[PDB]
Amino acid sequence: SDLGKKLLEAARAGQDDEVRILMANGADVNAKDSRGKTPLHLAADYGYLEVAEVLLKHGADVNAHDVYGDTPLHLTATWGHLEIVEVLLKNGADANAIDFFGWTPLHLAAYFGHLEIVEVLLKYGADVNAQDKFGKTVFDISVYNGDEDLAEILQK
Ligand X SMILES: COc1ccc(C(=C2C=CC(N(C)C)C=C2)c2ccc(N(C)C)cc2)cc1
Q: What is the contact surface with ligand X in residues (CB under 6 A)?
A: 78, 101, 111-112, 134, 145
User: Which of 28-52 are b and which e, b meaning 16 or more Cβ less than 10 Å from the residue's Cβ?
Assistant: ebebbbeeebbbbbbbbbbbbbebb
Residues 30-89 contacting a second copy, CB under 8 A: 34-35, 46
Q: Whose Cβ is closer to ligand X: residue 28's or residue 101's?
A: 101
- Residue 76's alpha-carbon distances to 6, 27, 42, 71, in angstroms, are 22, 24, 10, 9
Min dist CB 147 to a second copy, Å, is: 9
Is residue 145 a contact residue for a second copy (CB under 8 A)? Answer: yes
Judged by CB under 8 A, the stretch of 16-24, 54-62, 118-126, 144-152 that binds a second copy is 144-152
Q: Are 22 and 3 in contact (CB under 8 A)?
A: yes
Is residue 146 a contact residue for a second copy (CB under 8 A)? Answer: yes
Q: Whose Cβ is closer to ligand X: residue 94's or residue 140's?
A: 140
Q: Look up residue 85 and give its DSSP letter.
A: H
Is residue 1 a contact residue for a second copy (CB under 8 A)? Answer: no
**DSSP helix/strand/coil, 56:** helix
Return the amino acid letter for 41: H
Q: Give residue 7's Cα distance to chain centre.
A: 19
Return the amino acid letter for 6: K
Is residue 15 a contact residue for a second copy (CB under 8 A)? Answer: no
| Cα 103 to Cα 65: distance, rounded to the nearest angstrom | 13
Judged by CB under 8 A, the stretch of 24-32, 86-94, 138-146, 148-156 that binds a second copy is 138-146
First and final C-alpha spacing in the chain? 49
Judged by CB under 8 A, the stretch of 50-58, 121-129, 134-142, 148-156 that binds a second copy is 134-142
Residues that bind a second copy (CB under 8 A): 9, 14, 34-35, 46, 134-136, 144-146
